Amino acid sequence: SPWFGMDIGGTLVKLSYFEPIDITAEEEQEEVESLKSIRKYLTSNVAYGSTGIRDVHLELKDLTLFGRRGNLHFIRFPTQDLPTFIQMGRDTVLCATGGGAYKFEKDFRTIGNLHLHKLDELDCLVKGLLYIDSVSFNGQAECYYFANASEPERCQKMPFNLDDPYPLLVVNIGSGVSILAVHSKDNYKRVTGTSLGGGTFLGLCSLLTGCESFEEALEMASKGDSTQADKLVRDIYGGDYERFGLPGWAVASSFGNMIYKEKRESVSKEDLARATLVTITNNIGSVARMCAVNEKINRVVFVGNFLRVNTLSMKLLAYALDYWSKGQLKALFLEHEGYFGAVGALLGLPNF
Amino acid sequence: SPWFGMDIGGTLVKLSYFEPIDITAEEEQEEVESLKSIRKYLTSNVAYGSTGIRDVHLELKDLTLFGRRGNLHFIRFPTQDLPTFIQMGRDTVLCATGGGAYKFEKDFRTIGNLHLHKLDELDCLVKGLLYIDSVSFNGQAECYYFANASEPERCQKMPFNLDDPYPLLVVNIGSGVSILAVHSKDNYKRVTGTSLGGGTFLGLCSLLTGCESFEEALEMASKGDSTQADKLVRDIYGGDYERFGLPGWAVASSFGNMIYKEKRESVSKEDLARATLVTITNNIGSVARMCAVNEKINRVVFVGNFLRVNTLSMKLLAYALDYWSKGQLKALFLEHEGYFGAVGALLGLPNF
C-alpha cells in the first residue's frame, strides 16, 4: 500500500516515497495502523536511525502521481545498512532497481507477502530523469549549468531548459560510472563506463588520508593543492607544450610528483585528497568528452552521488568540458542527481 | 662528432648512440682522445655511474645509418640525474627531444660549443617507430602481439608485420599518456591524452605500499590480488549485470572496496600494488579503445616505458582490448618501446 521506489546501489540505497496529501476522512478512518505508523515515521523524522537521511530540500510538494496528489520524498542510507532496513521491515509492492535488487532479492522476500519487482538500473535512471525534469522542481528548473565556467569571478549556477532533451549523454557517477546515449524516451544505449568512479575517490582518499566519510574527504580536498602531488606539463617542459596546445598548468601525470621520496614526505593529506578528487573528476570528464564526440551529442548531463555537496567537482567538470572541447560541449547538472533510479522504479508501479 | 639522439622525458632520459664499426686505419689515427674515450666508456660498460643502464639486448648490430655501418645502442637514466650527465659532459651536435629539451636547454648550453637542436617529442616518436620497424630488430620482427590473449594456456607472444603501418593508433605510456592517430609518415594528430599514466602507477604505488622502485612495484603487483581492493560487478549484483553484458568479474569501482575500514585493515601491500596496476592499465586500454573507434583505426600499438619488463600490463591490455572490442581491435607492442623518441631525434641529425 505505501508507494516506494528503491535503488539499491553498490554504495548507497536511494528511496523515493510518495506521501498522499489528499487522504479523505473515510480513507483516514479505514487505514491500518501500520500504514499510519510508517507515514508518520517517515514524515516526522529527517534522520532515520543512525545512518538514514531525508533530503528535505529535494521534496516535490503537491505532485500529482497515479491520479493522487502528494509529496515526493527522497531518502538515502548506506547499502551496508540494508539489513537494518529489512529487519525494521519485518517488525507492499516494492519496485526495486540497482544491483542490490538482484543481490538482495532473497532478503527482501523475508518480509512476508511483500512483492518484489526488479527493474533495470539504467532504464529506471532514464525514466526518472525525464520524469523529474518534466514535472519541474516545484516550478524551478531541475537542470542547471555553470555560466562562464572559464572565469571564476563570473562562474555561476544558472537554470537550463531540457524540454526537448534528446539526444542526451547521461554520465552516471556512482560507485562506478556508466555513460548512456539517450536518443528518445525508449531508445538509449550504454556507450561505455569507467571503473574510476565515486568509489575510487572515496576508497583512495580513505587509504591516503585516513578520512572516515565522503564529506570529510571533500573538506580535506577543499583545503588542498593538487599540484603538490601531480606532475604538470610545466614540470616536464618548463612551460606550455605549445606545438599541441597543452597549457603548462595541465596535469601530465596524476600523482606523478609522488615518485620522489622527499615530495611524498612533504605532501599533506589535504593535498592528496584534492589530487584524488581532481584525478577522478578529470578522467570522468575526459571519457564523457570522448563519448559525446563519438556519439555526436553536445549536451552532457552528470548525475550520481559523487557530485552530492561537491561543487568543486561540478565546477571542474564545467570548466574542463568547455575548455578541452573548445566550447563545443556543455556540462549539465540536475538537482535530484542521485535519486533518478529510485523515481524510475516508483514509476513502474502501475505495471504490476 | 659522436652521434647521439636524446629524449628527456618527465621521468626518464633515453639516449640512442650510434657506434661506428667501419672506422678506417686513418680515421683511428686521426681521432681525438676524447672521442676515443667516450666510445670506449659507452661500449665497455653496461652500467654508467649508479643509475645509467645500457639495454644491451636491444642493440641493433651492423646498422647502416647516414652511410656508415655501426651498432645502435640504447641507454637510459633518470631525468633527476641529468645534472650528473651534464657535469660529466663538461669534464657535438645534440638532437634532443621530450619536454626536457626545452626545460634544460640552458643547462645543455653550459657544455662549451655544444649545439643543441630541439625536436618535437611526438614527431620524434613517430619517426623513430617507423624507422626501427623498417630496419627490423636484427632480422626479427620489431612488432609483436599476444595470440589467443583470451586464454592463458594459449596466450603467447607472436611477431606481427607492420610493413604497411598506416593507419595506426600509437599509445605512448610515459609519465603521462599521449595518443596519436598516424595516417602517413608525415600526417598524424594527437587525438587526446590521459594523465593517468606510468607516473600515476609509480606515484600511487609508492604512497600506498612504500615501494622504492618501479621494479619493486611490479614485483609486489605480481603477488597481489586486485579484487581485494576493487569492487566488482558481482559485488554489486551478486553476479553478472546481464542486460548490458557486463561480466561479474568486471571491475565496477577501482579501489571501491577500500571504503570499508575493515577491508582497508586486511588488504596487503601486494594487493594494493596490483589494484593500482590493473586500474591504470584498464583505463589506458579503455581510452585507447574509445580513440580507435572514433578514429576508425583497428591497430593500436602501445609504447613507452610503463610497459618495460611489465608482461602483466601487456597481457592485460591484449586481453582487455580484444574482449571489450569484441575482437575488433588488436593490441600491438614493440621491442624498443621506450626508445623511439631518442631514435627519431638522432634521425634529425642530417638537417643540421
Ligand SMILES: Nc1ncnc2c1ncn2[C@@H]1O[C@H](COP(=O)(O)OP(=O)(O)NP(=O)(O)O)[C@@H](O)[C@H]1O
Ligand atoms: N510467467 C508467469 N506466469 C504466471 N505465474 C508466474 C509466472 N512466472 C512466475 N510466476 C509465479 O508467480 C510468482 C511471482 O512472479 P513475478 O510477478 O514474476 O514476481 P517476481 O519474480 O517475484 N519479481 P520480478 O520478476 O522482478 O518482477 C513466482 O514466484 C511464480 O510462483
Ligand SMILES: Nc1ncnc2c1ncn2[C@@H]1O[C@H](COP(=O)(O)OP(=O)(O)NP(=O)(O)O)[C@@H](O)[C@H]1O
Ligand atoms: N554519504 C555518502 N556515503 C558514501 N558515499 C557518498 C555519500 N555521499 C556521496 N557519496 C558519493 O556518492 C558515490 C555513490 O553514488 P551513487 O550514485 O549513490 O552510487 P551507487 O548507486 O550506490 N553505486 P552503483 O551501483 O555503481 O550505481 C560514492 O562513491 C561517493 O563518491
Ligand SMILES: Nc1ncnc2c1ncn2[C@@H]1O[C@H](COP(=O)(O)OP(=O)(O)NP(=O)(O)O)[C@@H](O)[C@H]1O
Ligand atoms: N634564422 C636565423 N638565421 C641565422 N642565424 C640565426 C637564426 N636564428 C638564430 N640564429 C643565430 O644562430 C644561433 C643558433 O641558432 P639555431 O640553429 O636555431 O640553434 P638553437 O636555437 O640553439 N637550437 P634549435 O632552435 O632547437 O634548433 C642562435 O643563437 C642565433 O645567434
Ligand SMILES: Nc1ncnc2c1ncn2[C@@H]1O[C@H](COP(=O)(O)OP(=O)(O)NP(=O)(O)O)[C@@H](O)[C@H]1O
Ligand atoms: N627504471 C624506471 N624508473 C622509473 N620509471 C620506470 C622505470 N622503468 C619503467 N618505468 C615506467 O616508465 C614510465 C616512464 O616512461 P617513459 O616513456 O620513459 O616516460 P617519460 O618520457 O620519462 N615521460 P613523458 O614526459 O610523459 O613522455 C614511468 O612512469 C614508470 O611507470
Ligand SMILES: O=C(CO)Nc1ccc(CC(=O)N2CCN(c3ccc(Cl)nn3)CC2)cc1
Ligand atoms: O557501477 C555500476 C552499477 O551497475 N556498474 C558498472 C560501472 C562501471 C563499469 C566499468 C565499465 O563499464 N568499463 C570499464 C572497463 N572497460 C574497458 C576496460 C578495458 C578496455 Cl580495453 N576497454 N574497456 C569497459 C567499460 C562496470 C559496471
Ligand SMILES: O=C(CO)Nc1ccc(CC(=O)N2CCN(c3ccc(Cl)nn3)CC2)cc1
Ligand atoms: O606526458 C607528456 C609528455 O609531453 N604529456 C602529456 C600527457 C598527458 C596529458 C593529459 C592530456 O592530454 N589530457 C588529460 C586531460 N584531458 C581532459 C580533461 C578533462 C576533459 Cl573534460 N577533457 N580532457 C585532456 C587530455 C598532457 C600532457
Ligand SMILES: [Mg+2]
Ligand atoms: Mg547507482
Ligand SMILES: [Mg+2]
Ligand atoms: Mg520473476
Ligand SMILES: [Mg+2]
Ligand atoms: Mg616520453
Ligand SMILES: [Mg+2]
Ligand atoms: Mg633556435
